[PDB]
Ligand binder design. Structure first.
Ligand SMILES: */C(=C\C(=O)N1CCCC[C@@H](n2c(NC(=O)c3ccnc(C)c3)nc3cccc(C)c32)C1)CN(C)C
Length: 339
């Protein structure tokens, strides 16, 4: 009727993202076509609801969050979310062109930070499912570095945070399980209590992957995940065995309170095969940024404002300080979250 399908941009379990022509509004768009199934149709209606709350408040698109244009339920019942056409996810870039250089990484960290502190302290929502697959480049345009001849992203490297289906609020289920496991914080795994700070754990795992091209935790099992945290970051806190909130979580510890060892030969090999982030990240400011996003203490862990205001971003993205989203170029902001 109004939207004519032009391209297939991507496909998955959720459904499809297509490029479409808006006949009444005279432009190209991306349309998310959700599979016409009761659980996804309702999670689309919930996902839609978080999307109108972002635009209606940020009416002049100050933060790099996705901005819905329109939506409808098709004549075949598929939920259809009309949005601007953005580019490919960060995962697509790192796999074709490799990791970003310090400047574009700093620019990416700045933008996601600005969006996340707006999410956390202005809307009081958590994303809970941030991953390189749903951080999209604003544009798919490419430039060539004259010295290295390698591909450079647009300057600045604008990105957009997507996939608001899993957004949570300030009294989500306390033992609720959030995040894709690769980017799932330990507080969620063992049900110790989680809030905004779990989005910052995911940023730590994403920033590691954007810089190394490798997942920090390529794991499918809670206990192997926890040993990898121990080998990449240091000992798990001693009190953790008394505070887990579900039976499943506490049975990963001794009667004494230490981690039970894995002996699946696949998990013994992988932990032996992981090396500490501190030896992989040679840049000391980038290392400190990643390590304190992966802090076991949810309150000493960096918040979104500290991440975007980190010394690493100030060194490699110095024009950070002339951006209208820089903290000192804004009025006094709501207080940052406590954990
Ligand atoms: C990377 C996944 C990825 O790049 N995308 C996730 C959804 C699939 C389509 C893809 N894509 C878009 N999408 C959008 O503009 C858009 C806007 C709003 N919401 C969504 C969900 C998507 N536009 C594109 C232009 C060029 C290339 C691509 C791929 C593209 C975004 C993971 N890899 C597929 C492995």
């Amino acid at each position: 009727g109004r939207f004519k399908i032009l391209s297939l941009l991507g496909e998955g379990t959720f459904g499809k993202v297509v490029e479409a022509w808006d006949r009444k509004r005279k432009e190209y768009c991306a349309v998310k076509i959700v599979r016409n199934v009761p659980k996804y149709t309702r999670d689309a209606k919930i996902e839609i609801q978080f999307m109108e709350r972002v635009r209606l408040s940020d009416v002049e698109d100050r933060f790099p969050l996705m901005k819905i244009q329109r939506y409808f339920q098709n004549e075949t019942g598929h939920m259809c979310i009309v949005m601007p056409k953005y580019g490919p996810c960060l995962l697509d870039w790192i796999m074709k062109h490799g990791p970003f250089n310090h400047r574009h990484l700093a620019q990416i960290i700045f933008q996601v930070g600005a969006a996340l502190d707006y999410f956390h302290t202005e809307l009081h929502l958590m994303h809970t499912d941030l991953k390189p697959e749903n951080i999209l480049m604003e544009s798919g345009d490419t430039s060539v570095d004259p010295m290295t001849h390698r591909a450079l992203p647009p300057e600045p490297c604008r990105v957009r945070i997507c996939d608001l289906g899993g957004c949570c609020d300030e009294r989500h289920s306390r033992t609720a399980i959030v995040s894709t496991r690769h980017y799932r914080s330990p507080e969620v795994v063992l049900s110790l209590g989680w809030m905004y700070s779990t989005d910052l754990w995911s940023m730590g795992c994403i920033i590691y992957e954007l810089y190394t091209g490798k997942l920090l935790y390529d794991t499918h099992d809670n206990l192997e995940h926890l040993h990898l945290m121990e080998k990449t970051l240091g000992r798990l806190p001693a009190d953790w065995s008394v505070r887990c909130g579900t039976q499943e979580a506490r049975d990963l510890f001794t009667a004494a309170g230490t981690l039970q060892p894995c002996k699946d030969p696949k998990h013994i090999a992988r932990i032996a095969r992981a090396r500490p982030v501190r030896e992989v990240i040679t840049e000391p400011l980038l290392c400190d940024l990643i390590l304190n996003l992966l802090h076991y203490d949810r309150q000493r862990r960096l918040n979104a404002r500290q991440m975007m205001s980190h010394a690493y971003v100030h060194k490699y993205f110095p024009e950070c300080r002339q951006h209208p989203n820089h903290v000192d170029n804004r009025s006094k902001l709501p207080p940052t979250p406590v954990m």
